[PDB]
Design a protein around this motif. Structure first.
Motif, PDB file in Angstrom:
ATOM      1  N   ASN A   1      12.970 -74.044  20.644  1.00 19.92           N
ATOM      2  CA  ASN A   1      13.509 -73.131  21.654  1.00 19.92           C
ATOM      3  C   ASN A   1      13.955 -73.978  22.837  1.00 19.92           C
ATOM      4  OD1 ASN A   1      13.244 -70.457  20.508  1.00 19.92           O
ATOM      5  ND2 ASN A   1      11.020 -70.663  20.764  1.00 19.92           N
TER       6      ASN A   1
ATOM      7  N   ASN B   1      15.492 -73.165  25.403  1.00 23.74           N
ATOM      8  CA  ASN B   1      15.531 -72.470  26.685  1.00 23.74           C
ATOM      9  C   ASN B   1      14.230 -72.612  27.466  1.00 23.74           C
ATOM     10  OD1 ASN B   1      14.689 -70.672  24.409  1.00 23.74           O
ATOM     11  ND2 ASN B   1      14.196 -69.277  26.102  1.00 23.74           N
ATOM     12  N   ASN B   2      13.081 -72.667  26.786  1.00 24.85           N
ATOM     13  CA  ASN B   2      11.806 -72.830  27.474  1.00 24.85           C
ATOM     14  C   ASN B   2      10.950 -73.955  26.897  1.00 24.85           C
ATOM     15  OD1 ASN B   2      10.738 -71.679  25.101  1.00 24.85           O
ATOM     16  ND2 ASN B   2      10.391 -69.660  26.043  1.00 24.85           N
TER      17      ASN B   2
ATOM     18  N   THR C   1       9.834 -74.849  23.587  1.00 19.56           N
ATOM     19  CA  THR C   1       8.773 -74.480  22.661  1.00 19.56           C
ATOM     20  C   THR C   1       9.301 -74.511  21.234  1.00 19.56           C
ATOM     21  OG1 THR C   1       9.245 -72.107  22.873  1.00 19.56           O
ATOM     22  CG2 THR C   1       7.543 -73.025  24.326  1.00 19.56           C
TER      23      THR C   1
ATOM     24  N   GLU D   1       5.306 -70.205  19.067  1.00 21.93           N
ATOM     25  CA  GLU D   1       5.270 -69.071  19.985  1.00 21.93           C
ATOM     26  C   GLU D   1       5.084 -67.756  19.246  1.00 21.93           C
ATOM     27  OE1 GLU D   1       5.333 -69.552  23.613  1.00 21.93           O
ATOM     28  OE2 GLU D   1       4.668 -71.274  22.418  1.00 21.93           O
TER      29      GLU D   1
ATOM     30  N   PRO E   1       0.863 -64.460  19.336  1.00 22.07           N
ATOM     31  CA  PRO E   1       0.529 -63.026  19.299  1.00 22.07           C
ATOM     32  C   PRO E   1       0.059 -62.541  17.936  1.00 22.07           C
ATOM     33  CG  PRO E   1       2.893 -63.325  19.361  1.00 22.07           C
ATOM     34  CD  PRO E   1       2.292 -64.664  19.633  1.00 22.07           C
TER      35      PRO E   1
ATOM     36  N   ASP F   1      -1.212 -73.186  25.713  1.00 15.66           N
ATOM     37  CA  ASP F   1       0.150 -73.512  26.098  1.00 15.66           C
ATOM     38  C   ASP F   1       0.154 -74.947  26.591  1.00 15.66           C
ATOM     39  OD1 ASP F   1       2.473 -71.842  25.811  1.00 15.66           O
ATOM     40  OD2 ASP F   1       1.464 -70.332  27.051  1.00 15.66           O
TER      41      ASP F   1
ATOM     42  N   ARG G   1      -3.176 -69.462  27.386  1.00 14.78           N
ATOM     43  CA  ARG G   1      -2.350 -68.257  27.347  1.00 14.78           C
ATOM     44  C   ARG G   1      -3.201 -66.997  27.440  1.00 14.78           C
ATOM     45  NH1 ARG G   1       3.204 -67.138  24.410  1.00 14.78           N
ATOM     46  NH2 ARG G   1       3.337 -69.240  25.321  1.00 14.78           N
TER      47      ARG G   1
ATOM     48  N   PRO H   1       4.776 -55.288  13.520  1.00 13.43           N
ATOM     49  CA  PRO H   1       6.005 -55.697  14.222  1.00 13.43           C
ATOM     50  C   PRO H   1       6.085 -57.189  14.495  1.00 13.43           C
ATOM     51  CG  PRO H   1       5.087 -53.722  15.207  1.00 13.43           C
ATOM     52  CD  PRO H   1       4.047 -54.253  14.278  1.00 13.43           C
ATOM     53  N   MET H   2       4.958 -57.835  14.805  1.00 15.15           N
ATOM     54  CA  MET H   2       5.002 -59.256  15.136  1.00 15.15           C
ATOM     55  C   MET H   2       5.329 -60.103  13.914  1.00 15.15           C
ATOM     56  SD  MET H   2       5.080 -60.972  17.770  1.00 15.15           S
ATOM     57  CE  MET H   2       6.161 -62.279  17.196  1.00 15.15           C
TER      58      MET H   2
END
Ligand SMILES: *[C@@H]1O[C@H](CO)[C@@H](O[C@@H]2O[C@H](CO)[C@@H](O[C@@H]3O[C@H](CO)[C@@H](O)[C@H](O)[C@H]3NC(C)=O)[C@H](O)[C@H]2NC(C)=O)[C@H](O)[C@H]1NC(C)=O
Ligand SMILES: *[C@@H]1O[C@H](CO)[C@@H](O[C@@H]2O[C@H](CO)[C@@H](O)[C@H](O)[C@H]2NC(C)=O)[C@H](O)[C@H]1NC(C)=O
Ligand SMILES: *[C@@H]1O[C@H](CO)[C@@H](O)[C@H](O)[C@H]1NC(C)=O
Ligand SMILES: *C(=O)NCCCCCC
Lengths: 253, 114
Positions: free
Chosen positions: A28, A30-31, A33, A38, A42, A245, B18, B45-46
């Motif tokens: 990525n 743009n940032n 990563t 990333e 989640p 991070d 994080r 969804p992830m």
């Protein structure tokens, strides 16, 4: 990845690891990563596997992936897996499996079978040492008594080496990244040496959850690929993992 | 190059951290097909975002749709049935997330695939 099994002055075992993954989908810009890294944060979840409302084993996994890469059986043993690189890797192993030879276990599944069903450190150790697999790997395994910690370097059909703890000779930790211990790390990716210097500076007396998290936060042991950091304590039943991070400046791998 | 060994980084805080990760309880008394139902309802969804981002890298070499037809239609039978709980555990995850079985398998054998 980086996996450490340390032993304080009073024989207590601390098992800590970093989970680096995500080079495969690119960068990525743009940032600064990795695309997958990333997207795996989640997805990371903690899992309390229970039988009869009693915890069989706990783990840290990515949601939707049934194999186990980090986990422990409370009071029994702890197991983290590190990726090993080889000439053809899983690809022969996969080919043999399709053509009909299914006498070998997939890498995520075997550690899943060991965490779910093995009863002792010696039983786990024997199965990880001698079970046929489709791809090479590193098995980093600690127990519940003193001196019960080892790195098992694995070929597909053979255990190349088992590096065990020996506090009497002054070996109170075992480190393993992604290269054979006797061989040299790739020039551009040496995280095994800073991991040792940090462990060595910390000293055997001071090794603990806090100092273990310290070494796994030092660059490059912490890097852009680091999805999470797990610190395990088999005797105390503690199992904590934290999303990570690496803000610029920080190395990519 | 390496950095000075870090001091006082635990408990986790700062731009290094994080956030905590959530606990889910997986009841092995349930049959394997239903073990991941609660987790996958909250995480579908992830994982769908990954498979998208997986399609884009594939697309830069050979077109993705034709690639994914083969993974979904021909890979599950190519690899056969997986042992023990895993064939049902992955079949459950595939149904609750609406994600084809071949892609759930590809996710789960990503180590062997490198
Ligand atoms: C660098 O930029 C990346 C892209 O801008 C960031 O990636 C995003 O991170 C988000 C949170 O970590 C993800 O959130 C999820 O997004 C999907 C897509 O819309 C939603 O369905 C989900 O509900 C949502 N969250 C959850 C919990 O389900 C984004 O998907 C993700 N985007 C991509 C393209 O991967 C990086 O986080 C960012 N990194 C840094 C350090 O800034
Ligand atoms: C752990 O071992 C148990 C028993 O050896 C396995 O449980 C059986 O699994 C088969 C296949 O999934 C089922 O048909 C049986 O009904 C299960 N019996 C019980 C009592 O659970 C279990 O599959 C093993 N786990 C792993 C991950 O290999
Ligand atoms: C440690 O593990 C062994 C099995 O290897 C088990 O018999 C024992 O009860 C466990 N706990 C202690 C305190 O030894
Ligand atoms: C860590 O060194 N290698 C990590 C795990 C590979 C993850 C496979 C999905």
């Amino acid at each position: 990845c980086t996996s450490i099994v340390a032993e304080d002055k009073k024989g207590h075992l601390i098992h800590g690891r970093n989970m680096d993954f995500g080079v495969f989908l690119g960068w990525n810009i743009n940032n600064d990563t990795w695309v997958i890294t990333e997207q795996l944060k989640p997805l990371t979840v903690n899992l309390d596997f229970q039988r009869n409302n009693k915890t069989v084993f706990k783990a840290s996994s990515f949601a939707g992936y049934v194999g186990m890469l980090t986990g422990f059986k409370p009071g029994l043993f702890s197991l983290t897996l590190n990726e090993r690189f080889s000439i053809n890797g899983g690809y022969l192993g996969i080919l043999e499996w399709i053509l009909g030879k299914k006498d070998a276990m997939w890498i995520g599944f075997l550690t899943r079978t060991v965490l779910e069903n093995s009863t002792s450190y010696e039983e786990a150790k024997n199965l990880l040492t001698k079970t046929k697999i489709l791809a090479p790997a590193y098995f980093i395994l600690g127990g519940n008594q003193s001196g019960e910690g080892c790195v098992i370097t694995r070929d597909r059909k053979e255990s190349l080496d088992v590096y065990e703890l020996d506090a009497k000779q002054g070996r109170w930790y075992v480190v393993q990244t992604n290269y054979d211990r006797w061989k040299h790390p790739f020039f551009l990716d040496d995280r095994r040496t800073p991991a040792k210097m940090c462990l060595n500076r910390t000293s055997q007396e001071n090794i603990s959850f806090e100092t273990m998290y310290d070494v796994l936060s030092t660059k490059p042991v912490l890097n852009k690929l680091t999805v999470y950091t797990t610190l395990i304590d088999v005797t105390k039943g503690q199992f904590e993992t934290y999303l990570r991070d690496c803000p610029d400046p920080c190395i990519g791998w | 190059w390496t950095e000075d060994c870090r001091k006082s980084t635990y408990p986790p805080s700062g731009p290094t951290y994080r956030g905590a990760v959530p606990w889910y309880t997986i009841n092995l008394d349930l049959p394997p097909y239903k073990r991941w139902h609660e987790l996958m309802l909250d995480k579908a969804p992830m994982l769908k975002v990954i498979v998208n981002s997986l399609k884009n890298m594939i697309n830069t070499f050979v077109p993705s749709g034709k690639v994914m037809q083969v993974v979904d239609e021909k890979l599950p039978g190519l690899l056969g049935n997986f042992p023990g709980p895993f064939e049902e555990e992955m079949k459950g995850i595939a149904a609750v997330t609406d994600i084809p079985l071949g892609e759930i398998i590809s996710f789960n054998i990503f180590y062997e695939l490198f």
